[PDB]
Design a protein around this nucleic acid. Structure first.
Ligand SMILES: [Mg+2]
Ligand SMILES: [Mg+2]
Ligand SMILES: [Mg+2]
Ligand SMILES: [Mg+2]
Ligand SMILES: [Mg+2]
Ligand SMILES: [Mg+2]
Length: 68
RNA sequence: AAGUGUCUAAGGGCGCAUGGUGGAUGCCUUGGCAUCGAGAGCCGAUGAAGGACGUGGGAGGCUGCGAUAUGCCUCGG
């Protein structure tokens, strides 16, 4: 996901997509452990996306770029 | 019969030849030392200096970072 395209998410579906990012990092972690995923770049990407969501969520309630 | 009369190397010495060991010498250098000219002269309870433990697809160290973890966002190049 991109910082710009995760701006149209207003206030709660942004947290809900943070939740599914956490869930998919979970499952991708599990397939790392069991060796059943081929592209291991995916958890780097997902971790970065979780960081992106957390960052944007922090800016919105610190007082920057808020809006639905 | 009397007599003179070489030669031998178990090993060793000396000199060569040919190797080994070793890391001197020479020539270097992502390291130092001494300065000069400019800067900046403080950091910390808004938690410092410095660390521990973690963090990467692969084990460890360094280095970076802090569960947002070799990373997140924005503005520039
Ligand atoms: Mg030398
Ligand atoms: Mg002062
Ligand atoms: Mg390494
Ligand atoms: Mg390492
Ligand atoms: Mg946190
Ligand atoms: Mg840019």
């Amino acid at each position: 996901v991109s910082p710009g395209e995760l701006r149209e998410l207003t206030d709660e579906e942004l947290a809900e997509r943070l939740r599914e990012s956490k869930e998919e990092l979970f499952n991708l972690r599990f397939q790392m452990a069991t060796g059943q995923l081929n592209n291991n770049r995916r958890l780097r990407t997902v971790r970065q996306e979780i960081a992106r969501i957390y960052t944007v969520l922090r800016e919105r309630e610190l007082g920057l770029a808020t809006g639905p």
